[PDB]
Amino acid sequence: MNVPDMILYNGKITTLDPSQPEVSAIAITDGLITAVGGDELLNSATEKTKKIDLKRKRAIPGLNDSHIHVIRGLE
Amino acid sequence: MNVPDMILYNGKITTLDPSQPEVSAIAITDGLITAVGGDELLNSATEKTKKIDLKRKRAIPGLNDSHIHVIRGLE
Amino acid sequence: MNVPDMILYNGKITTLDPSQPEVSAIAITDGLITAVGGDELLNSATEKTKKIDLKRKRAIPGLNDSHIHVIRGL
Amino acid sequence: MNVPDMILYNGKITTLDPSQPEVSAIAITDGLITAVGGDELLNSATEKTKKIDLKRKRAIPGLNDSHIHVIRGL
């Protein structure tokens, strides 16, 4: 496991992975999901890793399709 | 024997499984994902399983939260 | 005079209308949004209009694009 | 004085404005929609305003709710 660019933890994340349909944390490196799980993912973080405490909130992947642009920056 | 209620196949489906971030088919049994993969999932289907040929459309989970209402039926 | 088929009210709705970026109600007629605003929309209803209380939920148009299939079975 | 921070144009943009349900461009100023319309919106841009050609893509507002975190960066 490489040092991830970002780790979101302490949340509710649906994965669409029959093995573990729901996790509380996910690690992202170069735009790719490198790990999913719980607080233990934090063991991979260094000073360069950005961390987001989801504060028990649900988290879902941003709409990502080649035919639609998701307008960001509103409110 | 485990039989899914619905099987969406021949599409593009993003998952948060690091080992399989993109599949073309997903199986659903009473509201939960039972399996993901390719058209081999259709071998698990039976007369009762609803099957949807995504015709290469991207499949995304609909907004599913008690605080959100998805407005249906707009043309 | 137009009477909407449906009115979704008491919600939180973004419009992309600079005049009123957020409203609490929307009126639907033959699949089209024919009005946006607040509770005053309910004055346009008749017994045939279906009124739905959004219960303060944030209401978002369903994603409808020919290239996307929104899974509703979950 | 007050200039747009971003301008998306040449796309397909649905608005909940009954009088103008569909536009191809929108102007965003400090998180707020300032204007909607066509290519003419580019005339309101300075050099600091970020501009994006949607290349005919459909543009949809991002999910913005305090109960949900939209994972960015893929």
Automatic annotation (TrEMBL), chains A, B:
<protein>
    <recommendedName>
        <fullName>Amidohydrolase 3 domain-containing protein</fullName>
    </recommendedName>
</protein>
TrEMBL record, chains C, D:
<protein>
    <recommendedName>
        <fullName>Amidohydrolase 3 domain-containing protein</fullName>
    </recommendedName>
</protein>
